[PDB]
Motif scaffolding. Structure first.
Motif, mmCIF file in Angstrom:
data_model
loop_
_atom_site.group_PDB
_atom_site.id
_atom_site.type_symbol
_atom_site.label_atom_id
_atom_site.label_comp_id
_atom_site.label_asym_id
_atom_site.label_seq_id
_atom_site.Cartn_x
_atom_site.Cartn_y
_atom_site.Cartn_z
ATOM 1 N N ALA A 190 0.811 -1.208 0.000
ATOM 2 C CA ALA A 190 0.000 0.000 0.000
ATOM 3 C C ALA A 190 0.854 1.272 0.000
ATOM 4 C CB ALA A 190 -0.925 -0.015 1.222
ATOM 5 N N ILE A 191 1.889 1.284 0.832
ATOM 6 C CA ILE A 191 2.780 2.449 0.919
ATOM 7 C C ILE A 191 3.503 2.719 -0.407
ATOM 8 C CG2 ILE A 191 4.822 3.422 2.067
ATOM 9 C CD1 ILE A 191 4.015 1.810 4.577
ATOM 10 N N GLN A 192 4.100 1.670 -0.966
ATOM 11 C CA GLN A 192 4.826 1.765 -2.220
ATOM 12 C C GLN A 192 3.895 2.121 -3.381
ATOM 13 O OE1 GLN A 192 7.743 2.644 -2.118
ATOM 14 N NE2 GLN A 192 8.615 1.367 -3.748
ATOM 15 N N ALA A 193 2.647 1.644 -3.345
ATOM 16 C CA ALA A 193 1.716 1.957 -4.423
ATOM 17 C C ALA A 193 1.467 3.467 -4.436
ATOM 18 C CB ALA A 193 0.405 1.182 -4.250
ATOM 19 N N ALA A 194 1.331 4.065 -3.253
ATOM 20 C CA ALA A 194 1.136 5.518 -3.172
ATOM 21 C C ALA A 194 2.422 6.239 -3.629
ATOM 22 C CB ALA A 194 0.759 5.929 -1.736
ATOM 23 N N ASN A 195 3.583 5.699 -3.272
ATOM 24 C CA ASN A 195 4.836 6.320 -3.710
ATOM 25 C C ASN A 195 4.939 6.331 -5.229
ATOM 26 O OD1 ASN A 195 5.855 7.010 -1.207
ATOM 27 N ND2 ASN A 195 6.859 5.027 -0.900
ATOM 28 N N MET A 196 4.300 5.355 -5.866
ATOM 29 C CA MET A 196 4.310 5.268 -7.315
ATOM 30 C C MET A 196 3.662 6.514 -7.918
ATOM 31 S SD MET A 196 5.424 2.278 -8.604
ATOM 32 C CE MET A 196 6.003 0.680 -7.914
ATOM 33 N N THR A 197 2.667 7.068 -7.221
ATOM 34 C CA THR A 197 1.965 8.254 -7.723
ATOM 35 C C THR A 197 2.771 9.521 -7.501
ATOM 36 O OG1 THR A 197 0.733 8.850 -5.694
ATOM 37 C CG2 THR A 197 -0.231 7.147 -7.102
ATOM 38 N N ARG A 198 3.851 9.406 -6.726
ATOM 39 C CA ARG A 198 4.723 10.538 -6.414
ATOM 40 C C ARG A 198 6.027 10.542 -7.206
ATOM 41 N NH1 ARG A 198 3.441 8.628 -0.726
ATOM 42 N NH2 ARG A 198 1.389 9.616 -0.387
ATOM 43 N N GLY A 199 6.254 9.472 -7.966
ATOM 44 C CA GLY A 199 7.438 9.363 -8.803
ATOM 45 C C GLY A 199 8.759 9.137 -8.086
ATOM 46 N N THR A 200 8.711 8.615 -6.870
ATOM 47 C CA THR A 200 9.941 8.387 -6.099
ATOM 48 C C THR A 200 10.420 6.947 -6.077
ATOM 49 O OG1 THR A 200 8.608 8.149 -4.097
ATOM 50 C CG2 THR A 200 9.569 10.318 -4.560
#
Ligand SMILES: O=C(O)c1ccc[n+]([C@@H]2O[C@H](COP(=O)([O-])O)[C@@H](O)[C@H]2O)c1
Ligand SMILES: O=C(O)c1ccc[n+]([C@@H]2O[C@H](COP(=O)([O-])O)[C@@H](O)[C@H]2O)c1
Ligand SMILES: Cc1ccc(O)cc1C
Ligand SMILES: Cc1ccc(O)cc1C
Lengths: 346, 346
Positions: free
Chosen positions: A83-93
């Motif tokens: 879940a955390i990494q999926a959100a990071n995907m939307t931030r480009g990091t």
């Protein structure tokens, strides 16, 4: 879905012959650019590319989902990392984000089954909050697997209508190298011990348990190796089904798909079992450091271009190989010709 | 030249430690980006990069020259191809030109000994019109080899003052896989039969003669394996000496150099024999299809990143690998960190 499979186009032998003749006449000894030449001819045969090796827009589709088998102690990463990494995907990091940016590709993050509240900005195609624990039963019903394959296939070919000509496939999901190994064992007929790896840094002392879990999954579910959908639904996962869907969709669309690592190999084995016609559209990227990679790749008759000892997942390897596909196109279209320089070779 | 060799800097262990700590904290399981991580740390240790993996301007230096041994019937390409292709390099229609353009690198074409009239637009550093036929004597005098090494080394580090931070090395010269094989045999102690390949499509039936020529070259010249300059001057060529010069120059400058194929491996063996301090600055690109590649790479303790069955030369493989070096830098600088996402791993 039967219509989908039936309508996958065969490669265009006419375009491939024209491409081969053109490549042989370029300013270099015949065959000297090796696999770059073979890759250009392969691309020329894909109907969605309009008879020539070319690359328009690029997209990496990252399939995210959680797995019930995480509870069997087969992964050291906290479950919430998906879940955390999926959100990071939307931030480009993330790793695939940074590598896709370097290749000029867009990342599409798709939630096909994360065990958490919906994440804003992520494409929502969730089947459920995590799939069933494969150690005690099936991951999902056959109906669920089929529905997800069709949904993802349609999404994929729909991007083609928006200018995308090259796809990269990826995933994100804690514990997913366990179902991947189960699938590889079933499709290749290899014992679990030969295909179970350390995934995301599993301690050497916990490998035995992971092997035991894979064997139990297969014994309890009895997946039929000759039925790719049966294997995916029984010992796979939503992320793995999603990756298979991207491959079926790109093939239906007559477009190329770059594989990533171990998880993608397991999905490719399933896709090819379901529809052999999908094979000419798959392009390998790198050689995953996961223990079972060699066996999986051997059964797909594939030799990756990149040896980077990579084992991140996310579609990172597929993104790293996009420049290679563009290089094959550049060679084809931009190099001069032997005849024009009055060079004659034996 | 003694000053040059003496002043090659050692890698910066402090910068490498800082780099390693930074990479371990990025958003991914530790070590998961494999050789991309190792490459970033290697770059961070190069003094010319200012303590961090970064890439500014990129240049591929292509060393062009003819060889007297062409007369021994060891190559099927007409000798004039060197001159013709060198001019094509100035027009951007060659293989390395197209691949360098894709990587955003500039190609510098240097004539170190073409057997033809000077070509406008090509950098002129010609030693003579082709080197001596190594089958009957030396390729050049020791003085000539030393002078060319110094000249090319200076040219190379001078580009560094113009913003170049990444070099790629290449060559162009009919019959040059013969001296390359001779050098590889001498430096590795392998028999000529194990390291002599088909070069630019030499017919299988002519291989025996090529092996005979390599053996005669070594017997007649008696090059000393412990003296890299002696080997280069006796059984090498101007193009090979030039490539060695780029490597010594980049190392003196504290900057990275990407190798290409078989010819570049032979030059790298010579460079490392002359100055072991050069080794930390060399980065492999691809695994040449030439028969003796495996042996040469084993002696350099190098594992290429790309397996493309390429055998063109020109610095084409080095150009193809430039995006990989940029990817390692992008990972380092652009990825998010674990701590920032509150992710804790064992
Ligand atoms: O792509 C590979 O070859 C790969 C190899 C090992 C681990 N992974 C990644 O790490 C996760 C799976 O590891 P694990 O130990 O939880 O089964 C998942 O999110 C993958 O993207 C990925
Ligand atoms: O770079 C390689 O690995 C490579 C392998 C085989 C042949 N070549 C190229 O072809 C030429 C040497 O081939 P040959 O048969 O004339 O010795 C020269 O111009 C090289 O750039 C290059
Ligand atoms: C014949 C030939 C040989 C080597 C090259 O780099 C290019 C050509 C065209
Ligand atoms: C822990 C972990 C696992 C897999 C990923 O893709 C990324 C991270 C950060």
């Amino acid at each position: 879905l039967h219509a989908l499979l039936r309508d996958i186009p065969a490669p265009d032998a006419e375009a491939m012959a024209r491409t081969q003749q053109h490549i042989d006449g370029l300013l270099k000894p015949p065959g000297s650019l090796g696999r770059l030449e073979t890759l250009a001819v392969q691309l020329a045969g894909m109907p969605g590319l309009n008879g020539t090796p070319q690359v328009g827009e690029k997209a990496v589709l990252v399939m995210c989902a959680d797995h019930g088998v995480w509870d069997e102690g087969v992964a050291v990463s906290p479950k919430i990392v998906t879940a955390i990494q999926a959100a990071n995907m939307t931030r480009g990091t993330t790793g695939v984000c940074v590598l896709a940016a370097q290749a000029g590709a867009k990342v599409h993050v798709i939630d096909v089954g994360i065990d958490a509240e919906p994440i804003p900005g992520v494409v929502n195609m969730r089947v459920a909050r995590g799939c069933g624990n494969i150690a005690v039963g099936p991951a999902m019903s056959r109906l669920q697997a089929e529905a997800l394959l069709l949904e993802v296939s349609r999404y994929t070919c729909d991007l083609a209508q928006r200018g995308v000509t090259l796809f990269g496939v990826g995933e994100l999901g804690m514990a997913n190298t366990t179902p991947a190994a189960a699938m590889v064992s079933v499709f290749t007929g290899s014992d679990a011990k030969e295909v179970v790896g350390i995934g995301a840094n599993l301690p050497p002392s916990r490998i035995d348990n992971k092997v035991d879990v894979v064997r139990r999954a297969i014994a309890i579910n009895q997946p039929n190796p000759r039925d790719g959908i049966d294997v995916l639904s029984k010992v796979g996962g939503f992320d793995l089904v999603g990756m298979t869907g991207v491959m079926l969709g790109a093939a239906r669309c007559g477009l190329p798909v770059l594989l990533d690592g171990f998880l993608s190999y397991s999905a490719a084995l399933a896709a090819c079992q379901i529809a052999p016609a999908v094979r000419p559209y798959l392009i390998p990227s790198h050689f995953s450091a996961e223990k079972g990679a060699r066996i999986a790749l051997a059964h797909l008759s594939m030799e990756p271009y990149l040896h980077m000892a990579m084992r991140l997942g996310e579609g990172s390897g597929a993104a790293l190989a996009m420049p290679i596909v563009e290089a094959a196109c550049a060679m084809f279209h931009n190099m001069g010709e032997l005849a024009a320089s009055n060079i004659v070779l034996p």
